[model samples]
Target chain A: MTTEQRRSLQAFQDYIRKTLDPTYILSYMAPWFREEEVQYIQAEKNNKGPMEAATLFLKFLLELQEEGWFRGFLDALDHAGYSGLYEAIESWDFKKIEKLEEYRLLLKRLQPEFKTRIIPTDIISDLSECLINQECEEILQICSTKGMMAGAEKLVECLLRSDKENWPKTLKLALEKERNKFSELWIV
Target chain B: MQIFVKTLTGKTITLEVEPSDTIENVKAKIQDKEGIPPDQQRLIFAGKQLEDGRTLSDYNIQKESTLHLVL
Candidate 1:
């Protein structure tokens, strides 16, 4: 690895150490690790920097990968929302993992369970409000465009629920006229 | 073969993988280098998610192939 590579690895390891609770994780993943291994980890953290300790920790997971026990670690990360750690493990190119085929399947299974952290709800609502106030042609365009049915439907519903009384007659009429268009795709 | 793994942030890592290596193996290396987890990684090659059990040969992933890694 280059110096940049080395530095990034150390930085990432420190990040994980700072972000996650070692005691809780150790208890949860104790099955794969022996008492000696666990003690070694504790010693590494106390005696070495987080980067060195994390390097050892990752080597432990790599051993788990070799033994088919890595899934437990992956599951723990998923439950904890440690996406950075998850991403680090996911981006590898190692070929020795047991039951490797099942790995991707497990990822697919876990995908929907990973909730999105950043919701742009306010921005979306603001856009909808702006469109509604301007009675913009963009609203109808958005409703008719492919893959925008959800946004259009939400905007229409928000307008209807919050400011139906103040809605321009044309906007109302447009929505009324386009109701059928969106209904086929948007209304569930 | 040498392949390029590009992160969502546009950071790229070049990896040398064997045809027999599983996608999970690739992910493990990325995690080592980039600190991304295999489960959280969405690797796209030919516009499809690369399966873990499959080999680079199975996907016809060739030299200098670029795979998009979305976290």
Candidate 2:
């Protein structure tokens, strides 16, 4: 593989290792394995096969954009220190703090020198600021950027309920804009 | 005719429509609002799989007609 591709893949691997959380993944990926979601993912590409498992896999990326899942997964992994690394992520013990710490330390010693690159420190610092600024602005801003956040359903329901009374201008525009737009569903 | 779009969580959304639309159009719209996928899905009405490639006009869906779908 090209050096660039190798670096990109390595970066992706590091990101997944550090960021991908299990709670939401189970919620999203469970549907894919089921008869129904599997049927739809396969048909989205017009194939009778498994092509769009990759696209359904796209949901994993979107889920990562979720803050609660992201933070929860990190805390879980951090607590899961070294010895805990050997256990499967699906195990319930990993969810507890002390046991997770045990696992995290074990993994740290065994894999300390693992070649993982992270976002540049300065960029990460700036990103922290940006996140704080956006969070202070609006719930929709957070939802649009993060895709999933704590109490997203509640926030959306609140908007819908509030809109029902005020028939807010933004909500009206959304309804009008989407009145005839087709769903982006692709059929094979 | 009305169509019932069910989520994986078992929540059901109901759609009522005019007869001018095609089945494809209905399916498309269902997914738009109810998040139902077309081929990864099927429509059930009157205790059977719906015949494909038909329009609402062909089926003569009434205001009270209901079709159940799993997507």
Candidate 3:
């Protein structure tokens, strides 16, 4: 493995732990990895939590000889719907990416405003259903366990981190579905 | 209708795509043909960023057009 990949591997692994659902990623990568490796990955997922499973998966990639899955890793990530992860490695300097980054910051910065103001029900379910399926699939844990405040936080973060290039479009339109209730914090 | 995905490395990948298909759909096809990730591809047509959610019809792209896949 090259020094650059080695450096990025740890950060990427941490990023997976922090923000991504690795189970869905595992499904896409199953075809690319060895049967034994896939079995181990599943075993870790079953035994430990998903975070640990992701850790072991990165380790498997780290140990591979002559280049490992490094070559095809980006493609797999994109296919798995975590396209932003690959974009993180290669600096795109894209205008779209810049706007996305700003939107993310806006969502994060105005957490208090959203926590108290937004309903978190329709927006959450709307996003979970229509276009933001995979991104919000694991929301049951947050939505059910935690109440409105945390749920709102989780929903906002996932929407900001979603792989779709135009989540804000769906979000803006979905907010419109709220009968213009969220007219103030318009996220378009 | 068919579309062309022109890469910066002097390779153009061709695909038989429908007007209804979104840019993300096109990216998936390119990912299948080449190893480039869908996110790595920033498809630009007529000097504008082609959004993943929008279709060819949304952009008035009817004919076989060459879209540059920039990083």
Best-fitting candidate, scored by DockQ: 3
**What is the DockQ for all candidates, taken in turn?**
0.02, 0.02, 0.04
The digit string of per-residue lDDT tens for model 1 on A62-113 reads 4442354555766666444444345555553223221222222222332221
Q: C-alpha displacement of A19 in model 1, angstroms?
A: 37
lDDT per residue as tens, model 2, A38-148: 345445434522223434433443333323443343344344331132233323232333332332332232221111211112122222221222222444454456533
RMSD of 1: 21.4
What local lDDT score does residue A129 receive in model 3, on the 0 to 100 scale? 35
**Tens-place lDDT digits, model 3, residues B1-71:** 67666665656666888878889888988888887899778997645789899987777554345565777
* Candidate 2 lDDT by residue in tens digits, B33-53: 866478777665543345567
**TM-score between model 3 and native:** 0.49
Across residues A5-42, which tens digit of lDDT does each residue of candidate 3 receive? 66667654555454454556566555346789888887
Report i-RMS for every model: 10.4, 23.4, 13.3
TM-score of chain A of 2: 0.18
Off by over 4 Å in 3: A1-21, A31-63, A66-75, A83-95, A125-134, B1-71
Question: Candidate 3, overall lDDT?
Answer: 0.65
How would the docking of model 1 be graded?
incorrect
